[model samples]
Structure formats: structure tokens, C-alpha cells
Target chain A: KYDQIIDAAVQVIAEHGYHQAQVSKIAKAAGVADGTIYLYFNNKEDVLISLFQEKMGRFVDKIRSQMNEATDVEEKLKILVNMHFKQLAADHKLAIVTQLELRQSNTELRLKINEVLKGYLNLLDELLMEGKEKGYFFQELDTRLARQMIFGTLDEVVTNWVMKDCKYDLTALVKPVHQLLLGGLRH
Target chain B: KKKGPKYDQIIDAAVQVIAEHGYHQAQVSKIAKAAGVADGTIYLYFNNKEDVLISLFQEKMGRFVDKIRSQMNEATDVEEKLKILVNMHFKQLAADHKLAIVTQLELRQSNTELRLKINEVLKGYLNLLDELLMEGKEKGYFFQELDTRLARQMIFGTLDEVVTNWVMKDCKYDLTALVKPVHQLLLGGLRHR
Candidate 1:
């Protein structure tokens, strides 16, 4: 039931946008009773927050597990970039919800969404630290700033892709993006 | 008793109200109070609250472009020009505490149409970066096949995220200090050899 509502919320939010996506709309999309949504979420904002929290965990785990066999920092970084692209590429509606719809909101909600993103960023920070200490990456690069650059570049690229209605192959840019970052990442 | 002839006053007060209070509560009347003008005066200068926001972005964005472009004229190389661009982006926002919060956070809460207009004004800044990237590529300083469009996204996106992070952190740190490092990172990514 929890997962069903989240999937439904993504569909509704992606189609109608965050502002117009009401609780009842999400409930109907989930094929559950109106009161059923309240059983899982406190309010409309809570639904959004809960949905992001749940989805973000799965998103992070998807990326995390994909890196298990890669020992080289460069390969790990490549996988990270690839998965970021591939994950969103696999789901256009989810991409729309995350890239465009979620951002269309007030500061308070953004703060909640930002909190959910912390764990995702923590994943990158780990990658950054491992590479730096292993001497595969630039020793002087600030981990936080590098994380910001990596995330910002990928995010902007995805946003552009979404803005263009996902007409292009997002994963095709994975290696190129990795190559671009390698210049800054590598010693 | 003309305190900058009401136009700048209203903008100034708008920034103050927006930065201090969140944009949802930064109503036209609140702005008028801050500007020491009648609520009708705001409408005289702007069609509505949305207009006030758009006009505010235009006024600031106009000066923002000129400031960077004029100073960039002194830069002899692509790297130096890049450094100046990064520095100016951080410095301008840092110099105006209220404007930074308004631009980075409060203003983003606007509707899609308003966001589109804000983005239109932002395109001017992005165009400058495009020219810089193209110049670097043609000079053999950057990868021959480097997509200037993607390159511009990298530059702008990185800098924007950095600034937004700084703003979210209450602007406690020195944003301009990242100019050299970020410029180096961008130069490294752009350069061929």
C-alpha cells in the first residue's frame, strides 16, 4: 500500500505538477480509499515528503549496489555517473517528477526534499573520499565542492534532458560525462 | 524628500521583504510598506506582484551582465576571463545579502511562467559563458569536440550549485574564495591537454 501510493504520487505529480497534485488525486491514482492515504501520510505535504523519502532510499540503493564489483575509483565514478543517468533514463515519469515537478514548490518543502538528498550525496562523498585517498583523484579537490560539481553537472544534464521531453539518450552521455569529470577528478 | 525616486526604493524594499520574509508572505502591501509608498504606487510601476518580481529580476540581471562583461574586457586569456566570470558571480551575490537570498531561494518559489521569465533573463548570463567556451575551444585550449552547450551547463550548473549551497548555509562562508579552485576545475575539464 505504501509503495503503491508512492508510485501513484509520482505519476500524478509528474502529470499534473506538484501544486495541482492533490491528496485525493493521488489516492484515486493509487486505487485506494481517500482515507487510506491518510493512514500512510499525515497530509499532502507529508505524502510528498514520505514519497520522496521512500523513493530516494530505493534510488540510492540502486546506485549503491551497482558499484559493488567495481574496485577502481575511476570505474566506480563512471558507474555512479552511469547509474544517475540510467536510473532516470529508465523512468520518464519519475524523471519528470524529480527533475521538474518537485522543484516547483515553497522553501519549506524544498528543505524536506533536501534532507532526503543528504543520503544520496553522502554516497558521492564516500566515492570522492575513497578516490582522493587512493590517489586516483585530485588530492587537492575539496570533496564537498567536487560532490557539488558532480551532482550539479549530472542534475543540469538531466534537467536539460527532461526539459527536452527526454528525447535524447541520457545514458549515452554517461561515459562522456565521466570523461569530462575525469579531467578534474584525476591527478 | 525623494529617496531614490520610488522605483529603486520599491525594488530595494522588495528585496528586503523577500529576503527577510519568505516570498509567500512578501505581498505587494508588505513591499509597499517597506518602500514607504502606497500599495497603488507598486501597481503604477508594476502590473502586479508577479510583475514586481519580474522587473526586480530584470533590473538586477541587467546590471549583473554589464558588470561581468565590462570587467571581463581586461582579461587577456580564456582562463583569466573564466576566473573573472566565476569571481563576479559570487562577488555580486555576496555583496548583496538580501538579493542573494531572494535570487537563490525566495524567487525560485514562483510559478512556471514566472520561472520561465526569470530563466529568460538568466540566458544573457549563460550566453556570456558560451562565448568564453567557444573562444577557448577555437584556440585549441579546450577539447576540439567539446560541446559548448554542455560545457556551459557544466560551468553554470557547478557555480549555481555552489552559490545555492552557500546561500542555504546563511552566506556564512566566503563564496569568492572558491573562484580559483572552481575556475581550475572548469579549465581542466575544458582543456584538451
Candidate 2:
């Protein structure tokens, strides 16, 4: 029920723009009573913030889950990039909500969005940390920059793809991105 | 900050107004007020909104390019030049929160022609990037047969994206802290061997 409202909110916000996206409209879209939305979220503000929290929560979950079968640090890194490319490509609406719709929110709202991103950033940090400790990466490798390079590079690439209106096969860039990042990370 | 003699009062005020009110709401009236001038005075200084945006980019990005050019020249080594570039890039933005917001997000939110114009102003910096890549390759620090186009994209894109993430995070972390590591990764790459 919670995801239903949040999912509906994402679609509504992405389609309707945040300012015009009313709680009642979201409730109707979710097929729940307005009262039901009130039970879960405090107000429109809560819905907007939860939109990021829920979407990013699952965003991180899906990547981490796909990365679980990795045979080594290299494989884990590959899966992380692989999932990121495919996930955003497969869900155009999700991409719209995250890249465009979410950016249109207020600074206060964006702060919450940034907070949710920290969780995702930390996930990549853990992977880089594992690689360093396993001796697959240099002993002096700064886990922080390595994490930034990977996320920032991919983020730039995807944002570019989205800005171009997703005209290309975004998944195709995974190999080059993986190699470039691996070229920078390996011991 | 000190790229040239001085900037017009309107240019400085635009940074604040746009940072506070955003590009859409930042009218000539508001900017004039921030600059301690009347709305008509802005027209005397510049023809229209388009001119103000392009001029604002010219002054700021001009300073950005000059500083990096001078700083890179001081370093001498091709490799050290990269560290200096990364260090100065982070230093400038990290120092000015409002300017960072305007460049990283506000200005970007402007219309398509404005975006194209913004990209035009960056050509100076991009030229510097091209210069460094070729120079480094000649000196044998950079990879031979490195595709200058792709290498340039990876380098600038990586640095730009990293800074945007910092801006998005509200400039909370020590950006300067990442300079050395970022330099190493870009210079040596992720390959362990």
C-alpha cells in the first residue's frame, strides 16, 4: 500500500510536475482513498520526500542484489556498472523522476534527496573499500575518490543519455565504463 | 576569483539573485535591485536577459580558465599539472557557495540556447584540456595512442561530475581532500598492473 502510493506519486510527479501534483490526484492514481494517503504520508511534502526515499531505497537494493553473485571484486564492480546502466534504461519513467522531476523540487526537498543518495554512495564506497583491502587495488587507493570516480563517471554518462532523450542503447556503454573504471581501480 | 581587473556590479549581483531566486524568477527588476540600480540601468549595461547570461559566463569562466592556465604553468611537470588543475578547480567552487549553486544547477536550468551559449564559454577551458592531453602524451606520462577525444571526455566529465556531486551534497565534504586521490586515479587509472 505504501509503495502503491509512492509509486503513483513518482508517476504523477514525473508526468505532472511537482508543484501541480496534488495529494488527492496521487491518491486517485494509486486507487486508494485520500484518507489512505493521509494515513501513510503526512502531506504532499511527505509524499515528495518519500518518493526519493522509496525510489532510491529500491535503486540501491536492486544494484546490491544484482552484485551479490560476483566472484570477486572485479566482478562486483562490473555488476554495479551493469545494473546501473540496465536499470535506468529499462525504466524510462524512473529515469525521468530521478533526473528531471526530482531536480525541480525545492532546496529543502533536494536536501532530503541528497540524503537518500548518501546511502547509494556508501554502497559503492564499501565495494571500493573491499577491493583495496583484498589487495586487488593499490594499498594507498583512496576509497572515497575511487567511489566518486565510479559514481560520478556513470552519473555523468547516464545524465548525458537522459539529456539526449534516451535515443541510444544506454546499456552499450557499460563495457567502456567498466573498463575505464577498472583501468583506474586495479592494483 | 581574480581573473581580471573587476566585474560589473550587475554580474556579481546576478550570481546572488539567481542563487537565491533561481534563473526563472530572477528578473531584470530583481537583479537591478541586487545591483543597487534601477531596472532601466540593466538595459543600459546590457541589451537583454540573453546578453546578461552570456556575459556572466564570459567573466566567470574567463577567470576560471586564466587561473588554471597560470597555475598549470607554475607546476611544470605534465603529471603535476593535473593535480594542480584538480586542486584549483575544487578550490574555486568550494570557496564560493553561491557561485557553485549558480553554475552547477541554476545556470544549467536555463533554456537551450543559453545552455549552448554556456557550452561556448567553456571552449577556453576545453582548449586547455586538449593542450594538456597532447603535452602529457608527448612527455610519455599519458598513455600513448590515447584517444584524445575520449580521454578528454573522461577527464573533464569525471571532474565536472565530481564537482556537481559535491554541489548537490551542499558542499559539506572537504572537496580539496579528494584532489590528490582523483589525480592519481585519472593519471594512473584503475588498472592495478
Candidate 3:
């Protein structure tokens, strides 16, 4: 299936980095003719862009659906945090690709990935606003800074973990971190 | 602290050599002569410049991590855990001017190869933060919805910025006082009750 192609793309890009990952190399790893990649992606950058859009898109969608069921906005916020960490923890390879390697692309490619990242940011913003309206989060909160802190915090932790080579269980820190930020919202 | 004869000499020599030559460029010979020791004598107790830095991290970073770890361990609730973590980071960096600068600015200039190994040492320090997060979640003191990955970043990043800011300021003011406010801001964003 097309699965092998994507796996090859992630692996090649992860090792060689975006600028150096060649399509021929990817094709060879996928065990397909070099021409085979051209049918699926216009180039290596496109493959990476699609990988982010497709895989990250799917990840956001799943988290969004879970957000829909919570009557309490605090619960929704927790769900967002839980799923994000859980997902990244579940797939170390994809987590490394999305969190670290993908960001190593040139500024233009980085911008494109950021463009894709906007959806995830929007997801956090929406949840914060919902918490505010529901009286779960403070109404006067700086939505933008809140979002930044939220995403920034998550980003830093994951990078530290990846930098640690995944020695300890990342999921174990979820509650303390949530409480550290959320404080009394749990009640 | 009390600067004994050798302590002040070594400290001053290290500062001079490291400041002028940079962390990586300052070799044993340079530091040795600066401290009035021959090159071989620098290794009498300390292995190398790396040992010097490792000892530095051990001396400075040890107390920093321990203060928070113990405080967090004693806290009966999540709120206190958050307070302790923020305070330890802000307080230690604020107290030691040279250490704050070395840790935040100069130390990172180590070659990438050495930086990777140094990063391996960081696991111990980072584990403290991870533990606080896990404890809060387990006690039901934190949001059950929290994502551990992002939360760790938020906490570390927030502390990182605070420390970096103090270092950039050259320690003109007390950072220990900022803990409560930063703690609250992080707990609920930049919202006033």
C-alpha cells in the first residue's frame, strides 16, 4: 500500500534531514522504482508537507471529537492535553518527525508546517474560549498568551523528552503538569 | 561565601580564562597558568575543563534541583508543588550571578558533540519537573485532561524564560519575589481574579 511510502519518507527525512532526504533514497527504501514517488508526491518537500497535513490533521480531528463530549470545559482542556501527550508518546518516530526533524526544514518549509500548525493552535484557542464562556476558565484571560503558554509549554516538554531519548515514561508526568498549569480548575 | 586563598585564585583564574577564551577554547594549560598551576596539575583533582563544568553543574545545579525536589515532596497538594517548582528555578538562578550567566548563556556555546553529552546529564534535573507533574496528576489535584508532554514544556519553558530574563538583567533585583505571580499567571494564564 501507500503506507510503505510514507514510512520511507519519515525515516529518510528523519535521518538525512529534510534538505538532504532524496526521493531516490526514499524510493529505494520503499522498494519501489524511483519514479513511483512522483505519482504520490511532486517532490520530497510535498511529501513532508502532506505528511504533516495528513497525519497531524488526523490527530487533531481525533482530539476534536473527544472535546465534543465534555460538558465541563475543564474536562475538555484536560482531554486536549491528555490526547496530545498520549499521541506523541504512542509514536516516538512520528513524534520525533513532527516535533523535531520537520521543524529543521528551511524557513519556507518551516512556515508551511507552521501554516499546518495553525489548526492545532486554533484548536487550543477554541477550547480556551469555551472554558471562558462556560465559566471554567477566567473570562479575562489573554487568549493569545494563554494559547502560547499552552502550546509553548507542551512543545518544550516534548522536546526535552525527545532529547532524553525517551528513557522515562512521558505519560507519567501528565497530572503534575496539568495541575501545575490548571491549579484549581480540577475542582 | 568565604573565598579561601586557593578558592579565590582558582575562581578568578577560571573566570579570566573562560571569559576571554570562551568555554570550549579555554584549555587546561590556559586555566592552569592563570591559576599558577602547570598544565598537569589542573588534573590533580579535576579531570579536565569538562570536569570543571560538571563540578560546576554539580555544585550549583545540585542545590537548585534538591531545593525544589524536597519542597515538592513535602507539599501536601498540587498548588504547593507548582509553587515549589517555580520558586526553585527562579530563586537559584537569581542568587548566583556567575552561575546564572554560565548556565543560561556561556555554557550552551560548548561544541554540539559535548552539548549532546551534557544534555544526557540534564535528564536528572528534568526528572524533577517530570515527577512534580506526575504527582499532581495522580493526586487528582490537577486536571485529568492534562497532556503530560506539553505540560512539561510549559513549566520548563516558563521557568527558562524567567531565569533567562534575570540573567539578561544582570541580577539587579530579587527574582524570588516573582514566584507567586508567575505561579498564578501560569496556573490560569494572564488573568486577574
lDDT of each: 0.83, 0.78, 0.70
lDDT of 1 by residue, A91-185 (tens): 99989877777773276788888999998899999988888788777677778888888899999999889877799899999877888877732
Q: Arrange candidates by DockQ, highest first: which order?
A: 1, 2, 3
Instruction: Tell me, by TM-score, which candidate is best.
Output: 1
* Candidate 1 residue spans exceeding 4 A from truth: A104-107, A184-187, B1-4, B189-193
Q: What tens-digit string does per-residue lDDT give for candidate 2 at B41-104?
A: 7887778766887798887788898999998888878878887888888899889888888887
Tell me which of candidates 1 and 3 scores higher on lDDT.
Answer: 1
lDDT of residue B16 for candidate 2: 88
User: Which 10-residue window in model 3 chain B sums to the lowest lDDT?
Assistant: B2-11
The C-alpha stretches of model 2 lying farther than 4 A from their native spots are A1-8, A20-39, A185-187, B1-7, B20-27, B46-54, B66-77, B108-140, B144-150, B161-178, B191-193
DockQ of 2: 0.24
lDDT computed for candidate 1:
0.83
User: Fnat of the models, one by one?
Assistant: 0.37, 0.31, 0.31
Candidate 2 lands at a TM-score of 0.80
| Candidate 1 chain B worst ten-residue window by lDDT | B184-193
